[PDB]
């Protein structure tokens, strides 16, 4: 074989992104037989330098997942890229934690396979464009950067939140994820504080291939707004050393292995 070239010959472009049809996971199953056990797939006819894990925060949202596996397996096979699908689900009924279950994603995902790259994605974000690849690049990477739901651009400059993408050594650099953000908010604002506070800057695809739908959806109960939130930013510099990949402790209660993707349910305590 040799290396896939820079730019895949399989891209489309612009993809038709909605969630009104219907879809079985026995159908995406079928339509994706390349996809094996766990969500794996790797090109047949070229070396990925790319070995990326997709991590995704889970709890309650197996209706937007088969919506996510229905549109993103055919994309990132057309991305030419050695990926595997990761979904942490969080157990209990405790406040939800979507940095702390990114962490374990990070760690649990190293355990199957040598992935030098992470993709950081919520399971509610689809990509309208293929060439917005699933992968990790030079600098810290922002995949979901025009969303429908923010008028097709970023809210601000620093979002970092939704989908994004970062390799071994980057998230290694910052100490990885924070795991003290309990409910709604602040934990992507924070990971951008600890990605400027390394000295790296964010890579972001234009505003045309970043176009990405958000499933519209209500909050789920136990992700109400962290009142913390706006404390923690402010002393990321401080806490970010002392919360992260090396204060990381969870138990996994349980692991699925499902022709999609690898369902890992953990306890990651509760808030304190
Ligand atoms: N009622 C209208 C406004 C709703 C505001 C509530 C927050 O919505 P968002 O800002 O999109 O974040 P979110 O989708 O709730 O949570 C982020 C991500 O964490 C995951 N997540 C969060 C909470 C939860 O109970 N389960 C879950 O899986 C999921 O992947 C989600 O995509
Ligand atoms: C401190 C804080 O709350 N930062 C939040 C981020 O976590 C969030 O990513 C962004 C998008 O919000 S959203 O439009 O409601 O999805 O809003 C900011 O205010
Ligand atoms: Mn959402």
Not at 169 to 189: A, C, H, M, T
Request: glycine share 6%; hydrophobic share 35%; proline share 7%.
């Amino acid at each position: 074989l040799t290396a896939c070239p820079e730019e895949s010959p399989l891209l489309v472009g612009p993809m038709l992104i909605e969630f009104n049809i219907p879809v079985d996971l026995k159908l995406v199953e079928q339509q994706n037989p390349k996809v094996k056990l766990g969500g794996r797939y790797t090109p047949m006819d070229c070396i990925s330098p790319h070995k990326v894990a997709i991590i995704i925060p889970f709890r309650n949202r197996q209706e937007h997942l088969k919506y996510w596996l229905y549109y993103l397996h055919p994309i990132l096979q057309r991305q030419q890229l050695d990926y595997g699908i990761y979904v942490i689900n969080q157990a209990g009924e405790s406040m939800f934690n979507r940095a702390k279950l990114l962490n374990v994603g990070f760690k649990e995902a190293l355990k199957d396979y040598d992935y030098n790259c992470f993709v950081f994605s919520d399971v509610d974000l689809i990509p309208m464009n293929d060439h917005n690849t699933y992968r990790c690049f030079s600098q810290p990477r922002h995949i979901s950067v025009a969303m429908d739901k923010f008028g097709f651009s970023l809210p601000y400059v620093q979002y970092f939140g939704g989908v994004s993408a970062l390799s071994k050594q980057q998230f290694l650099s910052i100490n990885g994820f924070p795991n003290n953000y309990w409910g709604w908010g602040g934990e992507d604002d924070d990971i951008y504080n600890r990605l400027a506070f390394r000295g790296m800057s964010v890579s972001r695809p234009n505003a045309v291939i970043g176009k990405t739908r958000h499933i519209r959806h209500s909050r789920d109960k136990k992700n109400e707004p962290n009142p913390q939130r706006f404390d923690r930013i402010a002393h990321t510099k401080e806490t970010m050393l002392s919360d992260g990949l090396n204060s990381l402790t969870y138990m996994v209660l349980e692991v699925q292995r499902y022709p999609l993707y690898t369902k890992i349910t953990v306890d990651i305590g509760t808030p304190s």
